[PDB]
Coordinates of C-alpha atoms and ligand atoms in Angstrom, one line a residue:
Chain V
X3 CA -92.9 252.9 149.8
X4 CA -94.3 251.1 147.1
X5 CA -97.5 249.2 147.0
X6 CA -97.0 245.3 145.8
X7 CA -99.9 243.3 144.4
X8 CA -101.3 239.8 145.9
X9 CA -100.5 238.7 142.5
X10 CA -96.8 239.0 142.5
X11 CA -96.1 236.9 145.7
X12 CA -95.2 233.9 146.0
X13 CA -96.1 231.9 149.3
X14 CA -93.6 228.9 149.7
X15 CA -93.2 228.1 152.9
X16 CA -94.0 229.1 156.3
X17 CA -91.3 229.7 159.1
X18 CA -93.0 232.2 161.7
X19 CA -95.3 232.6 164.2
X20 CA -97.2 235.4 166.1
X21 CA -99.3 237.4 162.7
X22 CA -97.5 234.2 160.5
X23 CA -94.1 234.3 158.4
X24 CA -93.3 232.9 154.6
X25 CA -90.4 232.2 152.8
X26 CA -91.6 233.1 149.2
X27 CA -90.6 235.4 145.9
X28 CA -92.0 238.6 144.4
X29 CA -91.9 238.7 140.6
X30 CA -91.0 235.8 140.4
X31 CA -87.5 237.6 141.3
X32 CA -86.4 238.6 144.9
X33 CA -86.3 236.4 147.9
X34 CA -88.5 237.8 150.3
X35 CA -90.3 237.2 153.6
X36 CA -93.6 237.7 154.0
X37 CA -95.3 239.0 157.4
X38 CA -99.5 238.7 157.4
X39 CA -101.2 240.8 159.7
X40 CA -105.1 241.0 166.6
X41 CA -103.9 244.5 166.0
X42 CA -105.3 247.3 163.9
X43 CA -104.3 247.7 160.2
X44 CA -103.9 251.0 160.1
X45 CA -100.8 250.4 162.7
X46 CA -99.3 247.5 161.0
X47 CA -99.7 249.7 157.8
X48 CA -97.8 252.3 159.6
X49 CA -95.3 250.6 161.2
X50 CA -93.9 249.8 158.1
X51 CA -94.2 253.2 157.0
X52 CA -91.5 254.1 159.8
X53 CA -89.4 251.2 158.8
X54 CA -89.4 252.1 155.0
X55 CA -87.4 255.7 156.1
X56 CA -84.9 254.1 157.9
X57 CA -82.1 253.3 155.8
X58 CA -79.0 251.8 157.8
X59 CA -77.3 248.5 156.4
X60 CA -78.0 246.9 159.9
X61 CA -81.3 247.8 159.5
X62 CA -83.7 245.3 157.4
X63 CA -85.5 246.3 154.6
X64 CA -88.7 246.1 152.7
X65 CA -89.8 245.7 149.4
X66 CA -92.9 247.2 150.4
X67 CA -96.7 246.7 151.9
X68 CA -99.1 244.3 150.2
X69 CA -102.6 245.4 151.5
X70 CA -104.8 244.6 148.3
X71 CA -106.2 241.2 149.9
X72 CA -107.0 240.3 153.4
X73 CA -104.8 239.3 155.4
X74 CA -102.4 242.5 154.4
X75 CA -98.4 241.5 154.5
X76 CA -95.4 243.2 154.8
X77 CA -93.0 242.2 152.3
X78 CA -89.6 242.2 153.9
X79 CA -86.1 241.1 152.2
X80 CA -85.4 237.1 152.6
X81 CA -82.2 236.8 154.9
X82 CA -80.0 234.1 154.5
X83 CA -80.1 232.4 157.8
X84 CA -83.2 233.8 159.6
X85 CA -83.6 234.6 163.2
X86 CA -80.4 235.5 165.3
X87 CA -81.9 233.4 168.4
X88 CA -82.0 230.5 165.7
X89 CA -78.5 230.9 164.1
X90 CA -77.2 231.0 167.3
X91 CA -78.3 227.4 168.0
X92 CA -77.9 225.8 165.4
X93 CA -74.3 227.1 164.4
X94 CA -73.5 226.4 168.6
X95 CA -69.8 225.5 168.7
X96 CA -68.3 227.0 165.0
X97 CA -68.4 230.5 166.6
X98 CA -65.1 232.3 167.4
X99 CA -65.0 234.8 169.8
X100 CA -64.5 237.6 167.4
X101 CA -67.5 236.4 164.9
X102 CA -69.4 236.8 168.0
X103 CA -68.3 240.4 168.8
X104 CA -69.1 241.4 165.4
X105 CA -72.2 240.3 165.7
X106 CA -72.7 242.5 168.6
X107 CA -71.3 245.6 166.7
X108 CA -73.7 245.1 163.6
X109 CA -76.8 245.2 166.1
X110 CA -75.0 248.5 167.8
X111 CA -74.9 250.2 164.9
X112 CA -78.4 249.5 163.3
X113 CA -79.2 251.0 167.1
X114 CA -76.9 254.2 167.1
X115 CA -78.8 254.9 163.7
X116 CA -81.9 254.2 165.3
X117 CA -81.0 256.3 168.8
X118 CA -80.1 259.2 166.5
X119 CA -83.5 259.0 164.7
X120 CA -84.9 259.6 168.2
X121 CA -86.3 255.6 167.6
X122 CA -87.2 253.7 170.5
X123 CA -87.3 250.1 170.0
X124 CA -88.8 248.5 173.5
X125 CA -88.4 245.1 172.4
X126 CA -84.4 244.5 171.3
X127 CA -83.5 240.3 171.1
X128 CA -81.8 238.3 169.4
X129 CA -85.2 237.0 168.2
X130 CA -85.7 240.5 167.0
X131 CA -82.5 240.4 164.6
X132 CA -82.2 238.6 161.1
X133 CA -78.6 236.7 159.9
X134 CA -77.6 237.1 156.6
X135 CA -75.4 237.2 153.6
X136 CA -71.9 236.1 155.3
X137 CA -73.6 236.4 158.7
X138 CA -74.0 240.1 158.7
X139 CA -77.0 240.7 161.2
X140 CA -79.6 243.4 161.0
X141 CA -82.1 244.3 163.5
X142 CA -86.0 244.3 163.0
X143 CA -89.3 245.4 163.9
X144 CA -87.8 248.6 164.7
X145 CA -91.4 250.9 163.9
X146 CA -93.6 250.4 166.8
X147 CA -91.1 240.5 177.8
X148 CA -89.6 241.3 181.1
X149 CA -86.1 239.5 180.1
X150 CA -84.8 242.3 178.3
X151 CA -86.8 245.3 180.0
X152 CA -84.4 247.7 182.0
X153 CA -85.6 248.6 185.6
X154 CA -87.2 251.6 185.3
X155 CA -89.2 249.8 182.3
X156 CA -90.3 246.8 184.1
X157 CA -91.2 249.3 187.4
X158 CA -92.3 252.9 185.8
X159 CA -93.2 252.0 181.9
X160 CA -90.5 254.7 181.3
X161 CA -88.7 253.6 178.0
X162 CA -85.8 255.5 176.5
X163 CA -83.0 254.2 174.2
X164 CA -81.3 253.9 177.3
X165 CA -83.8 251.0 178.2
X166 CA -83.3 249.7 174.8
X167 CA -79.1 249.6 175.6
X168 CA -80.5 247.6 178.7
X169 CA -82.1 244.9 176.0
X170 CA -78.8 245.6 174.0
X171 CA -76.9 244.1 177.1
X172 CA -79.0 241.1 177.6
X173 CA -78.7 241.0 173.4
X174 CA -74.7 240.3 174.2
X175 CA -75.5 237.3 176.4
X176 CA -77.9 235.6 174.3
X177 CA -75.0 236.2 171.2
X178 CA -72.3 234.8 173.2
X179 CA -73.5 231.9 175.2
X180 CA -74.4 231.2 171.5
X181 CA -78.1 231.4 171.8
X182 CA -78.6 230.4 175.2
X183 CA -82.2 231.6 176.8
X184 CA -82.1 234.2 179.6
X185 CA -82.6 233.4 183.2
X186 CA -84.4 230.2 182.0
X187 CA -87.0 228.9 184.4
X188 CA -86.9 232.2 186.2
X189 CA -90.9 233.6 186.4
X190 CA -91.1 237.2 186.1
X191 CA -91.7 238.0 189.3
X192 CA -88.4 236.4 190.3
X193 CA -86.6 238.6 187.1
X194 CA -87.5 241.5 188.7
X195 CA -87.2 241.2 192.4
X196 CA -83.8 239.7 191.5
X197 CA -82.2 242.4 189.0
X198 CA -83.7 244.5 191.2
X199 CA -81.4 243.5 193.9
X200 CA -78.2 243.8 192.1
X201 CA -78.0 240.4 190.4
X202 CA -76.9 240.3 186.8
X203 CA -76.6 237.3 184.0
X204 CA -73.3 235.2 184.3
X205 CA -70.2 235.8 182.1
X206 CA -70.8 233.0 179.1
X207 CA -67.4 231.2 179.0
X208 CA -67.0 232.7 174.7
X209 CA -66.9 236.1 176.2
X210 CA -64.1 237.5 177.3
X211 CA -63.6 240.2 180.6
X212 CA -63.6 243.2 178.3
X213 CA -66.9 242.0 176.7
X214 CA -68.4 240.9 179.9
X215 CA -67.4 244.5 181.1
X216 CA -69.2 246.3 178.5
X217 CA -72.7 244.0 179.2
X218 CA -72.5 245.5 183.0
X219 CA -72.2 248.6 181.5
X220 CA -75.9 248.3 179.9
X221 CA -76.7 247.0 182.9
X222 CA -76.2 249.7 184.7
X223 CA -80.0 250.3 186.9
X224 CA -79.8 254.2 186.5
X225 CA -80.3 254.8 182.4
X226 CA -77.6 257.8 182.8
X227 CA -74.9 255.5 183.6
X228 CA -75.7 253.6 180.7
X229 CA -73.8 254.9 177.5
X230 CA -75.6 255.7 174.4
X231 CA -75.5 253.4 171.1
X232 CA -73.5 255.5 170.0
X233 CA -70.5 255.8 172.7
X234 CA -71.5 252.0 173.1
X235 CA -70.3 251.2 169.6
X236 CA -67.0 252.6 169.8
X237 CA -66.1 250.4 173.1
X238 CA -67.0 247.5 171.3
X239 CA -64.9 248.1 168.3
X240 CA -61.7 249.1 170.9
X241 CA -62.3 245.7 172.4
X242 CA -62.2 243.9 169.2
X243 CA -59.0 246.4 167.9
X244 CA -57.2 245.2 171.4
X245 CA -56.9 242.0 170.9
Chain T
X20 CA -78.2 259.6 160.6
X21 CA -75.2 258.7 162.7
X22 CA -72.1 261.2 162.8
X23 CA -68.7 259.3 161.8
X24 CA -65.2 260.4 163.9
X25 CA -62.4 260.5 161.5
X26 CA -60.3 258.3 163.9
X27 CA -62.7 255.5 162.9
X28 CA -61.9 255.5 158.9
X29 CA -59.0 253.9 157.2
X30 CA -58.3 254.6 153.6
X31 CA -57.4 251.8 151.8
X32 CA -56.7 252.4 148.2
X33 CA -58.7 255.6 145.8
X34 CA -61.2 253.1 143.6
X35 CA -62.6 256.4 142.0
X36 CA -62.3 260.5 141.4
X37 CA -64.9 263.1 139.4
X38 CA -65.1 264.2 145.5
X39 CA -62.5 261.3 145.1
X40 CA -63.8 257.8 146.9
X41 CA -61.7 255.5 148.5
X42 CA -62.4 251.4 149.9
X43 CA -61.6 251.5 153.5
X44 CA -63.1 250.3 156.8
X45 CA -65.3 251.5 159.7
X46 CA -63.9 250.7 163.1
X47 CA -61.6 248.1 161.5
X48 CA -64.5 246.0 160.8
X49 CA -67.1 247.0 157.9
X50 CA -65.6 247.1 154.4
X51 CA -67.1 250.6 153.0
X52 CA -66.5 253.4 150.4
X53 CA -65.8 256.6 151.6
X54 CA -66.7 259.8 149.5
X55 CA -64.7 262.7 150.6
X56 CA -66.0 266.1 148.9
X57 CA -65.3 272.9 144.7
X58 CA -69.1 272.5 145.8
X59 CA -71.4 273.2 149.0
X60 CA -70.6 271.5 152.0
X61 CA -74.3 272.0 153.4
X62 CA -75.4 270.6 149.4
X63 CA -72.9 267.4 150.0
X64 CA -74.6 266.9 153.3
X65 CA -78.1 267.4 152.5
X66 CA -77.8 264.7 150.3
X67 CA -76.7 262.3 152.7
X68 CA -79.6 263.3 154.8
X69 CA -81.8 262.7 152.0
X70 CA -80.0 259.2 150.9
X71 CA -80.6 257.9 155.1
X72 CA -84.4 258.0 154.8
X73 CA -85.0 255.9 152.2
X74 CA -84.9 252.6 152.7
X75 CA -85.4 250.0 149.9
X76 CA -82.9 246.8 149.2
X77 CA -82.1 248.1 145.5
X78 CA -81.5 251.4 147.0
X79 CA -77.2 252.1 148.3
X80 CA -76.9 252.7 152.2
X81 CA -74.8 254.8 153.6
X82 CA -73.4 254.0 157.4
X83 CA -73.7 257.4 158.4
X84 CA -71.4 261.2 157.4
X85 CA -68.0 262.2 158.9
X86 CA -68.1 266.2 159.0
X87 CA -65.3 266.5 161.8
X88 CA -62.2 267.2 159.7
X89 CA -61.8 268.5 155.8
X90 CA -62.3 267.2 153.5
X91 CA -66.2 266.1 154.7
X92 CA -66.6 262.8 154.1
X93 CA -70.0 260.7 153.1
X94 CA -69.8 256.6 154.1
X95 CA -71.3 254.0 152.2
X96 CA -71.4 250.6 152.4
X97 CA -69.0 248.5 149.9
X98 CA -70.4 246.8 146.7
X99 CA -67.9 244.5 146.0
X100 CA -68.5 244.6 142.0
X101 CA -68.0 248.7 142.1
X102 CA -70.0 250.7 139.2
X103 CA -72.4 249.2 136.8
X104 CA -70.8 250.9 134.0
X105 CA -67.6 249.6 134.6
X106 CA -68.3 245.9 135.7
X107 CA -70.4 245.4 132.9
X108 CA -67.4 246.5 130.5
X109 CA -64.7 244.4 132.4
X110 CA -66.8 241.3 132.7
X111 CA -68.2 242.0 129.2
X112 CA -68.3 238.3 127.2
X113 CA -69.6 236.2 130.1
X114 CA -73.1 238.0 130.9
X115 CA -76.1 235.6 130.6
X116 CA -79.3 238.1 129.3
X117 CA -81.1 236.3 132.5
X118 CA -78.6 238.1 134.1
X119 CA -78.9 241.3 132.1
X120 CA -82.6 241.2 132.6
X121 CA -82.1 240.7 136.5
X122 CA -79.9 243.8 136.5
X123 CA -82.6 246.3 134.7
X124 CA -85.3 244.6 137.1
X125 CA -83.1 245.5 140.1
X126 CA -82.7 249.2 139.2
X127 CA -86.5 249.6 138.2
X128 CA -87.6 248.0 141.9
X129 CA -85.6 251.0 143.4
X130 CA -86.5 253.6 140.7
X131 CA -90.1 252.9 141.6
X132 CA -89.5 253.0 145.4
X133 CA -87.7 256.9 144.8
X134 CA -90.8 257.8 142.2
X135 CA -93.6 256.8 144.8
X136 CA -91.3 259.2 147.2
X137 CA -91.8 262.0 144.6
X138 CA -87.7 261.8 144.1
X139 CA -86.6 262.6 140.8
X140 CA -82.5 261.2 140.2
X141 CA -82.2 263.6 137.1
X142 CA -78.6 261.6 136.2
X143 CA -79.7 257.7 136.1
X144 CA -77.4 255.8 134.0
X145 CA -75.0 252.7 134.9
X146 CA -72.4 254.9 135.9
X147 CA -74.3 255.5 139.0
X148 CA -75.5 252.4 139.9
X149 CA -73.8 249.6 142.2
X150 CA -73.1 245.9 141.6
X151 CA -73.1 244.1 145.2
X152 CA -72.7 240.9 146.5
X153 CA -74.6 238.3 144.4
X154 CA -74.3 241.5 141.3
X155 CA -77.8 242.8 143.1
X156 CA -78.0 246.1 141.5
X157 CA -78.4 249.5 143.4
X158 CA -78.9 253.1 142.3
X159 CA -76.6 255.6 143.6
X160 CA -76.7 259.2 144.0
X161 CA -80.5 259.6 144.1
X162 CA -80.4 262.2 147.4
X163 CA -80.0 265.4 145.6
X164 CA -82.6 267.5 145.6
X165 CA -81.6 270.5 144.4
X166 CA -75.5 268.1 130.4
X167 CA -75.5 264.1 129.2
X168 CA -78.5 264.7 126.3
X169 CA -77.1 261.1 125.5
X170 CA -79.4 259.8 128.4
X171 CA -82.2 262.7 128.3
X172 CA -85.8 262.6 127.5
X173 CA -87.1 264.8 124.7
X174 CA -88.4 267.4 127.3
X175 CA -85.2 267.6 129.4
X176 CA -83.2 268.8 126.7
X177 CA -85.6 271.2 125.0
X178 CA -86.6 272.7 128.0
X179 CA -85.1 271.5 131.1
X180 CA -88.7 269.5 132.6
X181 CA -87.5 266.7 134.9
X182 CA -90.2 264.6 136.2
X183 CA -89.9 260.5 137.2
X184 CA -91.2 260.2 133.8
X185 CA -87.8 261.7 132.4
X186 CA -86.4 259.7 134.6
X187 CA -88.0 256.4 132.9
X188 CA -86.6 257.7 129.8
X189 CA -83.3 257.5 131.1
X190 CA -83.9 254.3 132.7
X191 CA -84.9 253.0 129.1
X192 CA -81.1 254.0 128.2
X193 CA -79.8 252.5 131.2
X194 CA -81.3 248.9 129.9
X195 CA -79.6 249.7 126.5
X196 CA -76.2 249.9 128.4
X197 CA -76.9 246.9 130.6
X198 CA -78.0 244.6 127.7
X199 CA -75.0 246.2 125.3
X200 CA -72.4 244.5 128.2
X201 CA -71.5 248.8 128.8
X202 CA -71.2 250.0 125.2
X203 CA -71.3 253.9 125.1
X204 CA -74.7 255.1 123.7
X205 CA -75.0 256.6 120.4
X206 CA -71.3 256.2 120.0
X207 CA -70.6 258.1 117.3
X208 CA -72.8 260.5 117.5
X209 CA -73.0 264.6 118.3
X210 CA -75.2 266.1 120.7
X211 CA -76.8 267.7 117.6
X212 CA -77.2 264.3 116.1
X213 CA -78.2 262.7 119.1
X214 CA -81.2 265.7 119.1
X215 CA -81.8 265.2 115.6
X216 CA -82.3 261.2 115.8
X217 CA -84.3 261.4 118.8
X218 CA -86.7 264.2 117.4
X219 CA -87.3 262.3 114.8
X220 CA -88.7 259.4 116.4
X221 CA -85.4 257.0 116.0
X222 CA -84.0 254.9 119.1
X223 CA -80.8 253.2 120.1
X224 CA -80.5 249.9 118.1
X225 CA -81.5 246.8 119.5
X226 CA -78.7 244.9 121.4
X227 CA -77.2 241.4 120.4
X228 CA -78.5 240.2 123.7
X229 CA -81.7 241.5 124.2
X230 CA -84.6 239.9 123.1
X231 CA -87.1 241.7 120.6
X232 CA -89.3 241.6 124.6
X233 CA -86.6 243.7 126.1
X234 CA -86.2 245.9 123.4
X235 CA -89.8 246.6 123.4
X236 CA -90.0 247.8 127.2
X237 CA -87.2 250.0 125.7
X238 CA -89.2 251.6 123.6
X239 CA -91.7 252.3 126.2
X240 CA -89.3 254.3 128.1
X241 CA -88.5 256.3 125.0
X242 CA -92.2 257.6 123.8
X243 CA -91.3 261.5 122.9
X244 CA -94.4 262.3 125.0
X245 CA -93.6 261.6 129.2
X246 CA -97.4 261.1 129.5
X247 CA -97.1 258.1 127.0
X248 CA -94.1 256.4 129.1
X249 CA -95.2 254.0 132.0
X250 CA -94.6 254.9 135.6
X251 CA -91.5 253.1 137.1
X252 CA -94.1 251.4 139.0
X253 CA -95.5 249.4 135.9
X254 CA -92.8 249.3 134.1
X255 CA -91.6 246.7 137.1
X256 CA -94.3 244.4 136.2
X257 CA -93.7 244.3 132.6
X258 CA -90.2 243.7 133.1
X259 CA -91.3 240.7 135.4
X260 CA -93.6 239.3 133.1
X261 CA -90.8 238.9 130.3
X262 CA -88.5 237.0 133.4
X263 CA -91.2 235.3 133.4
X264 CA -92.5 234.2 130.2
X265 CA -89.1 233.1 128.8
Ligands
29Y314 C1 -81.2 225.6 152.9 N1 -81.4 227.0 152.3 C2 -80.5 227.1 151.1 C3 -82.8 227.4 152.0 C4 -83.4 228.1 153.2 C5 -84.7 227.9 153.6 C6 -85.2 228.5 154.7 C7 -84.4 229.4 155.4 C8 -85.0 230.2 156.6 C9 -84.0 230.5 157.8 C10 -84.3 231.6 156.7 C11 -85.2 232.7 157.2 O1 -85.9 232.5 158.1 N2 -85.1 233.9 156.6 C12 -85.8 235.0 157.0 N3 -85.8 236.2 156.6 C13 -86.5 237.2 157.2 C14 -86.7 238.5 156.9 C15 -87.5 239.3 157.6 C16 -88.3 238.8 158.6 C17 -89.2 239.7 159.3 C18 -89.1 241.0 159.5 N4 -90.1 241.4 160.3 N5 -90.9 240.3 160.6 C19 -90.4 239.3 160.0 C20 -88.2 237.5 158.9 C21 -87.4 236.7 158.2 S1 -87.0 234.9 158.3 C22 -83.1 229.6 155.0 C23 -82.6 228.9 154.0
29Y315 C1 -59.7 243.3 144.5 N1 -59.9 243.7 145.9 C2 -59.0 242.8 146.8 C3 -59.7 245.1 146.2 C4 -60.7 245.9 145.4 C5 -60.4 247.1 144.9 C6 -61.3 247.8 144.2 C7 -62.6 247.3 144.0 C8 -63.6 248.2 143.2 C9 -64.8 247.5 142.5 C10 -65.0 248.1 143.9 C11 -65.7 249.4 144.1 O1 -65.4 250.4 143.4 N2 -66.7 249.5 145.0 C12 -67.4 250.6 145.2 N3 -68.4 250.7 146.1 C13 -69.0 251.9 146.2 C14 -70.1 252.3 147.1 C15 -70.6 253.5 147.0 C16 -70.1 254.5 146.2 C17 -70.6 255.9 146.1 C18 -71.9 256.2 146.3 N4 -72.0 257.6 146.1 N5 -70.8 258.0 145.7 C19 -69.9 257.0 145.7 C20 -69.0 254.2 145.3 C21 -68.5 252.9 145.3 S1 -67.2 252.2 144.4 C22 -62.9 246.1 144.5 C23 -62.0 245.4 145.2

């Protein structure tokens, strides 16, 4: 990918955490936000040397890698509205159903793309996925939190995109209860004694049966029983084709 | 890339034909255009394959291939605007050269992106660029791998050399479309004239709209020798620096 000089950014203003997020401009030009670099170089380098070969419209871009002056950035394409997790909140109560599953289907299909690139994600969220032009969502951080882990994650470390369908499910419930936070005030400890035991994340009142279906089906504790992205995607799209 | 069942597609109305191409939807959600495809099925492919693995904003995207029934089909997202070439002469009266400026800058981001990747488009011109949502620019057809003189270097049409460096020199032609509002270069011209002119050190005219700045980033791209023409890669910051100066 290309190579962007310190010169040719623009810093404007801050809106992330960690390393730390800008809103800013390169060339004066394109939107763009900004990600500065503990963790090695070397793997924040590479990381978006995975990202810069993954080209899927759900999948966000970058202009390219800025690593001239320390701190290096990442310079990433400015979207709209900003974190998912966010959007969700502050747009709480102008979201129809069907906005809401097509939210859910941009995500699956940056993931199908990402499954079929034998991609592994291991830390799918709403807070991992950006809003924007006419609220078309992409996912991020897709190069390299118990809440989203499937079982055999949080017990045997054993990820597969089958784990990430697991975060994919708990994805669904933070986009329908409209941003809501996961087993809030849950430690976890409790997370995973209790999925362990069966339970599962109530139905948010926006989602409908059929969708609350298909979230028990990523929830499903063996990863086999799980469908793929890609078998995932196409019972979300019958859902929103049924009516 | 991710493998598209026919059942999913619906064909809308044919927007183009050279394969034909079609606005439809995926899964009755995501506007796209779909590309159906004499020539090699394993070529048309390839080129998808290519096109999914790199990733740049000024750069089209494809939302995956459909190779279950015949005609094979390639699906890309929609750009509302449809090609350069044609917006540019349908919208032709109302173009601020901020604008015009913004699309050359657009292309040049991507061209640079493909010539640090060692890929070499061969056939960049406006035709084959995209005007999205906002008129962002993106360059098509940039996956193959593996005529028009009117966009070729010196060394392509004496003896066939394509390098990203040819590729600037077609870029260079590319601004003179943009900035000409999708004028036909070298109008009324022969190939043989178009040889001639070129081989003797003369250039496409300057355009109403562009300023004597713009024209000189033009001439940049056309230097007879490809060693003398700036990599797509600085030619980015010149063109910045005119945006900038005003
Ligand atoms: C009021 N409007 C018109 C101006 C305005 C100002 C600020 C924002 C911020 C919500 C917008 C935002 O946060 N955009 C972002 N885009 C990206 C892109 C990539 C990444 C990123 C990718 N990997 N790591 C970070 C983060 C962001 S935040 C929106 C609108
Ligand atoms: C007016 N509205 C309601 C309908 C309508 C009809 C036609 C158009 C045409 C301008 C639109 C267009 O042609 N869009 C295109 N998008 C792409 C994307 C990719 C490719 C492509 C990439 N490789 N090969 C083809 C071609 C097109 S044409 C817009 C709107």
């Amino acid at each position: 990918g290309s190579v962007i000089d310190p010169s040719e950014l623009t810093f404007v203003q801050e809106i992330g955490s960690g390393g730390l997020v800008h809103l800013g401009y390169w060339l004066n030009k394109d939107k763009v936000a900004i990600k500065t670099i503990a963790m090695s170089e070397e793997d924040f380098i590479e990381e978006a040397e995975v990202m810069m070969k993954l080209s899927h419209p759900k999948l966000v871009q970058l202009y390219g890698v800025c690593l001239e002056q320390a701190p290096i950035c990442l310079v990433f394409e400015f979207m709209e509205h900003g974190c998912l997790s966010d959007y969700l909140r502050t747009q709480r109560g102008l979201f129809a159903a069907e906005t809401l599953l097509g939210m859910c289907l941009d995500v699956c299909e940056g993931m199908a793309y990402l499954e079929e690139a034998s991609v592994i994600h291991r830390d799918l969220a709403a807070r991992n996925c950006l809003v924007g032009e006419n609220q078309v969502i992409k996912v991020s951080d897709f190069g390299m939190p118990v809440k989203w882990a499937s079982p055999e994650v949080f017990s045997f470390s054993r990820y597969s995109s089958k784990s990430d369908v697991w975060s994919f499910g708990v994805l669904m419930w933070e986009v329908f209860s409209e941003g809501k936070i996961p087993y809030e005030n849950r430690s976890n400890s409790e997370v995973v004694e209790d999925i362990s035991t069966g339970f599962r994340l109530y139905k948010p009142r926006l989602a409908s049966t059929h969708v609350y279906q298909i979230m028990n089906h990523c929830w499903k504790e063996r990863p086999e029983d799980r469908p793929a992205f890609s078998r995932l995607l196409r019972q979300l799209a019958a859902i929103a084709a049924s009516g």
